Amino acid sequence: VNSFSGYLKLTDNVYIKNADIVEEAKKVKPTVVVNAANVYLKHGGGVAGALNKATNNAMQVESDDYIATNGPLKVGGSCVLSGHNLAKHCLHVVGPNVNKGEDIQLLKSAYENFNQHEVLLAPLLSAGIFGADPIHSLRVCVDTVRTNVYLAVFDKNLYDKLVSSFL
Ligand SMILES: Cc1ccccc1C[C@H](CO)Nc1ncnc2[nH]ccc12
Numbered sequence: 001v002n003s004f005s006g007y008l009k010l011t012d013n014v015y016i017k018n019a020d021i022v023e024e025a026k027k028v029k030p031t032v033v034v035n036a037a038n039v040y041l042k043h044g045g046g047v048a049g050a051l052n053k054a055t056n057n058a059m060q061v062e063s064d065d066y067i068a069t070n071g072p073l074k075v076g077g078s079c080v081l082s083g084h085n086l087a088k089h090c091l092h093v094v095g096p097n098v099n100k101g102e103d104i105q106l107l108k109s110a111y112e113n114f115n116q117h118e119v120l121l122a123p124l125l126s127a128g129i130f131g132a133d134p135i136h137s138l139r140v141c142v143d144t145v146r147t148n149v150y151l152a153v154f155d156k157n158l159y160d161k162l163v164s165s166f167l
Pocket residue numbers: 019020021022036045046047048050123124125126127128129130152153154155158
């Protein structure tokens with residue numbers, strides 16, 4: 001039993017809700033919140049910009065030190081950093097950005113990072129400003145993640161379509 005509330009159950013391990021991931025994180029304080037990161041950990045817009053803003057830019061300061069030490073992530077890769085005031089940890093995961101020409105096949109690799117954590121709050125990877133079809137992102141999620149994932153989806157019109165079209 002966990003404190004996630006109001007989710008629809010898609011599968012044995014995947015749950016989905018129309019919600020602002022920032023507001024959800026502040027309520028649940030999950031062990032792991034997933035960020036929709038880029039390889040530079042430059043948290044400008046979308047989920048990343050919103051999470052970082054909610055940390056008063058502390059996420060960005062920490063991320064800049066991470067990059068200065070380790071260099072960029074890989075597309076499909078991830079790193080674990082602090083969750084600041086939002087969660088214990090933030091798993092920064094880089095899905096492919098279709099608007100940068102990156103290989104959508106990398107989306108499965110991106111979701112595989114979730115399997116290293118027993119429970120996560122997360123957005124749909126590569127959706128939104130990363131340019132991929134969110135229906136496809138949900139499918140890859142369900143077919144790749146085996147741990148317990150609570151998906152937030154901020155956009156209301158997007159949520160209803162994802163539920164109604166789910167196979
Ligand atoms: C995946 C992605 C990345 C970048 C931009 C937009 C999206 C699409 C999703 C679904 O709507 N966005 C969000 N999902 C949950 N919590 C959110 N909080 C603020 C935005 C937001």
